[PDB]
């Protein structure tokens, strides 16, 4: 998986044109993520390739099989100048010369990346949810006065384009999430928007499983341990599979809360539907405290254990 970075002495203009093509809905094909990575690199490392290659982001991406193939040009002022002559890029090129040049402005790259970041909290849910959420966030930050997005970015078509770009692109998601988490707390509005989005993205797609896990746990000053009902013979397989899925998730470390969004490996079975009995136990224990588990419906077959879990928690 070869990622092409574009290297010129007109990086800002090239980048803004990559944003032009992306926003136009033009399919960049196998250059998409390469283009995206260039943007990120121009933004966070000011196109210093040596500073990037030694970064945790490049570290991780290389550790995940990505190979960086830099295309040095310069004198190239135009994204069109930079695409290989190779004929499987013919339609791309054909579309790109129909591109209007919005003269490169300052902060438009950060503008773009923050916009993208607003789609993250509900990305795994779907386009409707991700986009609705994005719009509500847009109005939030707008009325904060911290940032104003162009209104034509708010049409449903354009936001479907962006949603798509995030879906297809692993690198974009990873860079935005990594920087959301690790980038400090300076004086760049876009970094704080991205940070806020990533903060709202934590455990996206994994909150039900998380809370079920929370509620089959038992606080004892002898450490902390599993619920006794969890340790019956009927629930010997659910606990096995759950422990295994949880280990797989745990592999991903600090990226574990974002593992569903980034589509990380090992998450197949981290889906509460597969664990009815543990869900029953957790909902019981939850009820006994008043609060409840959102998104968890116990079918008849496990209603008994549900009360079995319920009453016993109230007698404690």
């Amino acid at each position: 998986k070869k990622v092409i970075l574009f290297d010129t002495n007109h990086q800002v203009s090239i980048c803004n044109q990559i944003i032009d093509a992306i926003n136009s809905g033009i399919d960049l094909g196998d250059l998409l993520e390469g283009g995206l990575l260039t943007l990120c690199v121009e933004h966070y490392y000011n196109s210093d390739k040596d500073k990037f290659n030694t970064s945790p982001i490049a570290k991780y991406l290389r550790d995940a099989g990505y190979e960086f193939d830099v295309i040095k040009n310069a004198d190239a002022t135009r994204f069109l100048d930079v695409i290989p002559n190779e004929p499987h890029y013919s339609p791309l090129i054909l579309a790109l010369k129909t591109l209007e040049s919005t003269e490169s402005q300052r902060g438009r790259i950060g503008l773009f990346l923050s916009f993208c970041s607003l789609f993250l909290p509900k990305l795994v849910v779907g386009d409707r949810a991700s986009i609705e959420k994005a719009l509500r966030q847009v109005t939030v930050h707008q009325e904060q006065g911290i940032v104003t997005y162009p209104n034509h970015w708010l049409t449903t078509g354009h936001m479907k384009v962006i949603f798509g770009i995030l879906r297809s692109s692993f690198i974009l998601k990873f860079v935005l999430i990594h920087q959301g988490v690790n980038l400090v707390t300076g004086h760049d509005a876009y970094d704080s928007i991205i940070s806020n989005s990533v903060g709202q993205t934590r455990f996206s797609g994994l909150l039900i499983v998380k809370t079920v896990l929370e509620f089959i746990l038992q606080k004892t000053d002898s450490g902390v341990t599993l619920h006794p009902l969890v340790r019956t013979s009927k629930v010997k397989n659910e606990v096995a599979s759950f422990k295994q899925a949880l280990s797989n998730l745990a592999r991903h470390g600090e990226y574990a809360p974002f593992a569903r969004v980034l589509n990380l490996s090992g998450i197949n079975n981290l889906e509460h539907g597969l664990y009815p009995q543990l869900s029953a136990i957790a909902l019981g224990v939850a009820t006994a405290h008043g609060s409840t588990l959102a998104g968890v419906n116990v079918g008849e077959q496990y209603q008994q254990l549900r009360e079995a879990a319920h009453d016993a928690e109230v007698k404690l």
């Binding site: 455990f203 809370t211 746990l217 902390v224 998730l249 745990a250 574990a256 809360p257």
Partner: peptide
């Protein structure tokens, strides 16, 4: 709550799963 920290730490790998599950 507070245990929420336990579930999350189990999930991020900050808490060994063997502490809570064992063997």
């Amino acid at each position: 709550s507070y245990m929420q920290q336990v579930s999350e730490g189990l999930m991020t790998g900050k808490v060994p799963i063997d502490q809570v599950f064992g063997a």
